[PDB]
Amino acid sequence: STAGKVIKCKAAVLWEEKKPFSIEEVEVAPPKAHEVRIKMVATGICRSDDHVVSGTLVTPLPVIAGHEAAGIVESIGEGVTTVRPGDKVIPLFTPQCGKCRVCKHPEGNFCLKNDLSMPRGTMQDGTSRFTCRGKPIHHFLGTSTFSQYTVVDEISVAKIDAASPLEKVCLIGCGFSTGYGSAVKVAKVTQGSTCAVFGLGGVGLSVIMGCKAAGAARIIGVDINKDKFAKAKEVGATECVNPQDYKKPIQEVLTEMSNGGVDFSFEVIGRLDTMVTALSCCQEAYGVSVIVGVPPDSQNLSMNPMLLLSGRTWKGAIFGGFKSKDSVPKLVADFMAKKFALDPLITHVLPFEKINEGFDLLRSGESIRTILTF
Amino acid sequence: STAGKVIKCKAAVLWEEKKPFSIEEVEVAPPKAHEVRIKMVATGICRSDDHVVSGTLVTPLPVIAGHEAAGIVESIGEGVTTVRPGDKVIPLFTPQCGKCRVCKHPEGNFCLKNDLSMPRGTMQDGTSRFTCRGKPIHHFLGTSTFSQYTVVDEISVAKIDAASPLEKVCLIGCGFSTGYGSAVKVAKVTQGSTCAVFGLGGVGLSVIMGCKAAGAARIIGVDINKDKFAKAKEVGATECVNPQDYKKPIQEVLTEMSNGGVDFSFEVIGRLDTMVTALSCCQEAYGVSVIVGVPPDSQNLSMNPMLLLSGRTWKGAIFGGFKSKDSVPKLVADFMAKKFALDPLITHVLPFEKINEGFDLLRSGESIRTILTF
Numbered sequence: 230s231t232a233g234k235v236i237k238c239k240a241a242v243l244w245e246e247k248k249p250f251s252i253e254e255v256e257v258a259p260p261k262a263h264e265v266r267i268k269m270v271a272t273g274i275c276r277s278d279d280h281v282v283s284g285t286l287v288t289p290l291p292v293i294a295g296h297e298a299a300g301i302v303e304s305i306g307e308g309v310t311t312v313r314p315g316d317k318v319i320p321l322f323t324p325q326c327g328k329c330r331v332c333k334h335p336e337g338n339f340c341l342k343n344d345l346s347m348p349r350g351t352m353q354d355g356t357s358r359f360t361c362r363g364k365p366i367h368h369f370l371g372t373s374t375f376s377q378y379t380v381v382d383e384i385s386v387a388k389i390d391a392a393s394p395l396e397k398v399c400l401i402g403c404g405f406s407t408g409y410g411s412a413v414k415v416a417k418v419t420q421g422s423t424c425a426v427f428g429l430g431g432v433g434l435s436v437i438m439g440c441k442a443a444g445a446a447r448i449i450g451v452d453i454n455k456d457k458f459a460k461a462k463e464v465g466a467t468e469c470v471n472p473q474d475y476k477k478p479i480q481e482v483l484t485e486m487s488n489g490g491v492d493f494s495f496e497v498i499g500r501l502d503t504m505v506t507a508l509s510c511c512q513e514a515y516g517v518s519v520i521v522g523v524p525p526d527s528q529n530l531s532m533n534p535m536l537l538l539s540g541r542t543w544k545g546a547i548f549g550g551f552k553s554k555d556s557v558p559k560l561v562a563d564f565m566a567k568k569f570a571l572d573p574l575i576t577h578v579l580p581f582e583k584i585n586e587g588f589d590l591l592r593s594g595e596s597i598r599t600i601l602t603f
Numbered sequence: 604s605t606a607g608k609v610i611k612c613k614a615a616v617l618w619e620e621k622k623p624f625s626i627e628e629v630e631v632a633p634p635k636a637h638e639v640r641i642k643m644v645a646t647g648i649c650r651s652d653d654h655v656v657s658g659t660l661v662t663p664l665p666v667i668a669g670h671e672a673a674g675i676v677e678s679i680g681e682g683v684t685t686v687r688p689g690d691k692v693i694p695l696f697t698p699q700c701g702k703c704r705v706c707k708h709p710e711g712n713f714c715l716k717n718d719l720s721m722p723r724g725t726m727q728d729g730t731s732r733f734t735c736r737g738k739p740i741h742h743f744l745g746t747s748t749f750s751q752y753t754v755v756d757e758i759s760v761a762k763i764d765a766a767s768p769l770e771k772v773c774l775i776g777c778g779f780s781t782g783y784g785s786a787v788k789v790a791k792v793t794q795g796s797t798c799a800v801f802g803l804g805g806v807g808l809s810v811i812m813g814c815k816a817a818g819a820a821r822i823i824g825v826d827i828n829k830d831k832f833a834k835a836k837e838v839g840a841t842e843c844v845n846p847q848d849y850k851k852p853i854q855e856v857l858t859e860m861s862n863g864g865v866d867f868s869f870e871v872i873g874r875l876d877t878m879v880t881a882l883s884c885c886q887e888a889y890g891v892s893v894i895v896g897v898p899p900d901s902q903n904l905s906m907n908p909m910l911l912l913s914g915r916t917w918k919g920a921i922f923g924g925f926k927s928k929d930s931v932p933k934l935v936a937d938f939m940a941k942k943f944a945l946d947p948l949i950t951h952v953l954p955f956e957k958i959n960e961g962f963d964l965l966r967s968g969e970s971i972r973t974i975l976t977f
């Protein structure tokens with residue numbers, strides 16, 4: 230009943246940095262060629278969405294944020310072949326065009342069509358599908374999931390199992406897959422190894438899940454909020470440390486705890502200082518450190534390259550290294566077969582209309598993931 | 604006969620920074636338990652030895668430098684099982700104790716007994732075997748090869764083929780193995796890939812050799828001294844670029860030349876700026892950059908961690924990642940079997956007494972390796 234028509238619906242519009250979202254009516258254009266219009270069902274609150282508010286992650290404003298979500302296709306534009314109306318789908322904030330040198334590379338996943346490295350806040354054609362108060366509104370990462378309806382490019386959506394619980398599998402659209410893949414795919418954690426995970430939010434808990442799935446013998450969680458430790462131990466941390474409890478810098482603490490440095494470390498916060506600390510705490514000759522956290526816009530870290538010359542490996546990744554469109558449906562299938570759990574990440578559920586309360590819960594330290602239902 | 608006796612011999616002593624070497628008589632104590640005294644046959648001049656002179660690489664002075672060499676065992680201390688008097692040997696500036704967590708790790712080579720991290724300038728037992736004019740003289744990296752005789756710990760020497768030409772295979776003690784291994788072992792260069800090599804001295808040429816051995820399709824040499832380009836092409840560079848020839852930063856030039864970034868880059872100079880440039884020029888999603896150059900003492904680089912978050916891998920290594928005592932004899936055997944060439948690295952052969960002339964050749968840009976002969 231809405232195919233080819235503008236849809237008026239509610240969205241959470243961010244007009245200004247460091248302000249609440251405005252829940253108000255927007256106009257969502259119908260999908261053009263190779264575009265998909267999605268009726269959203271559930272969306273998680275990821276710290277990266279908060280980074281848009283705080284100006285940590287710069288993207289043009291005004292904007293509809295949201296990138297961790299699941300929904301049902303309402304309509305498809307001309308030439309779409311990979312989804313149909315009524316399909317369950319997860320928007321892909323990292324696209325998979327299938328044609329660029331990264332998509333063709335066996336390891337690569339950061340498709341050259343992404344809108345993360347130099348955000349423009351548009352569709353692939355450089356235009357917007359959203360109007361609010363007669364004004365064009367930017368997209369976010371090609372997804373814009375804080376809306377009852379969004380429009381995405383076909384390379385930014387994956388069809389998932391029709392029997393999927395969308396209020397759970399939305400987490401496969403960012404925080405679970407990122408953390409789990411950072412451990413299993415990017416770091417390639419080994420059986421019997423010692424891991425250190427800096428930051429015990431939804432992504433860091435997913436890193437722990439991946440380290441435990443890979444057979445790590447020790448998984449040391451690191452957080453300044455000791456309220457995060459109980460859940461970290463539930464999902465596989467063998468011990469947790471709060472840097473504020475120690476006189477010495479935590480890289481020295483972790484090096485001593487691991488009898489000379491850890492095998493694998495993960496920065497899952499977004500601070501320059503913890504990226505350098507996480508590198509330093511991995512064993513100097515064979516350690517691996519993975520940056521997962523999003524750094525503050527345009528800021529450089531300072532480090533001594535002797536940390537690398539001795540033999541350390543330092544890498545980072547988007548979306549856990551997963552090729553998004555190939556991997557998301559498989560992750561959903563594995564979830565349905567109980568190969569991993571998502572409930573440990575979900576601490577709060579709210580209606581979409583209470584999105585600002587969901588951000589309050591994240592900012593207070595209380596929540597891991599709040600799932601918003603449309 | 605010399606066994607069990609102090610040897611008086613000629614050595615090149617560095618009394619203070621930024622002074623010529625002093626060629627004079629030293630006393631070399633006999634080897635203690637688990638030590639080996641070696642009559643030197645040939646030693647190369649590596650830029651790292653010049654770093655000791657320039658204060659780029661801090662180690663206690665006064666010192667007998669030299670770490671890239673080959674010679675013949677004169678005597679062994681009690682308990683030595685791996686070499687005998689008369690054996691051809693290469694001193695190992697990276698030891699292989701076989702007992703530490705690094706030696707037992709499949710991918711580690713920076714043995715915890717090394718004297719590079721936190722240089723003491725001694726034997727393993729914390730004492731020196733060298734005196735000159737009644738003063739104790741420091742060791743360098745457990746090797747000290749700028750002497751007619753040295754004493755090394757057993758874990759810092761490898762027995763090699765008795766038919767080895769020592770005036771060539773001394774380069775397996777540092778520069779060849781470092782560069783070749785940085786390509787084939789540390790980076791794991793792939794067939795058909797595009798590589799960029801920053802710095803076309805003895806080590807950078809050895810990186811090129813390894814990239815070509817690994818089947819790279821394109822190998823771009825980068826040097827500010829265009830006199831280095833002809834030899835770089837001879838050993839496998841497909842093209843060479845001088846940053847001084849361009850208005851743009853060379854990372855932009857290399858990204859354009861490689862249609863979006865190289866597969867593998869190598870920093871083989873020792874500058875903070877070129878370490879960051881070499882990282883930046885590798886493809887943002889799947890590129891790998893290896894730091895080989897020794898950085899200036901206590902200086903930090905500045906970089907944007909988004910370079911890593913998109914998917915790059917950054918690592919460094921000592922001695923090409925090779926476990927030194929296992930690898931050096933095999934590399935010599937491979938050289939004897941014509942698996943690689945050393946002559947392209949050798950531009951000058953001088954008597955040991957001409958050490959200062961050999962350093963002046965390096966500093967002027969006029970040599971690759973000078974081999975000093977005893």
Ligand SMILES: NC(=O)c1ccc[n+]([C@@H]2O[C@H](COP(=O)([O-])OP(=O)([O-])OC[C@H]3O[C@@H](n4cnc5c(N)[nH+]cnc54)[C@H](O)[C@@H]3O)[C@@H](O)[C@H]2O)c1
Pocket residue numbers: 275276277280403404407427428429430431432433451452453454457472497498499500503520521522523524546547548549594597912
């Ligand atoms: N690379 C990617 O693709 C990707 C995906 C998802 C999230 N992210 C980023 O990953 C980071 C974590 O996201 P999240 O899990 O949703 O966030 P979160 O829930 O805010 O978790 C971060 C955790 O870090 C803890 N923390 C803050 N400061 C410190 C400190 N100095 N030392 C130790 N712990 C500290 C904090 O208490 C919290 O539990 C954020 O920067 C995100 O933007 C990146």
Ligand SMILES: NC(=O)c1ccc[n+]([C@@H]2O[C@H](COP(=O)([O-])OP(=O)([O-])OC[C@H]3O[C@@H](n4cnc5c(N)[nH+]cnc54)[C@H](O)[C@@H]3O)[C@@H](O)[C@H]2O)c1
Pocket residue numbers: 538648649650651654777778781801802803804805806807825826827828831846871872873874877894895896897898920921922923968971
């Ligand atoms: N990691 C290890 O185990 C190891 C081993 C051996 C050598 N090294 C280091 O590797 C580096 C190279 O050693 P080497 O080959 O003997 O030295 P080298 O022969 O002096 O070669 C260095 C090359 O870098 C070139 N160069 C200088 N500045 C620039 C610039 N700004 N841009 C581009 N090219 C430049 C220079 O012209 C020369 O050809 C030194 O820092 C050594 O200390 C490290």
Ligand SMILES: [Zn+2]
Pocket residue numbers: 324325326327328329330331332340341342
């Ligand atoms: Zn692509």
Ligand SMILES: [Zn+2]
Pocket residue numbers: 275276277278296297403404
């Ligand atoms: Zn996210």
Ligand SMILES: [Zn+2]
Pocket residue numbers: 698699700701702703704705706714715716
């Ligand atoms: Zn060892």
Ligand SMILES: [Zn+2]
Pocket residue numbers: 649650651652670671777778
């Ligand atoms: Zn050297």
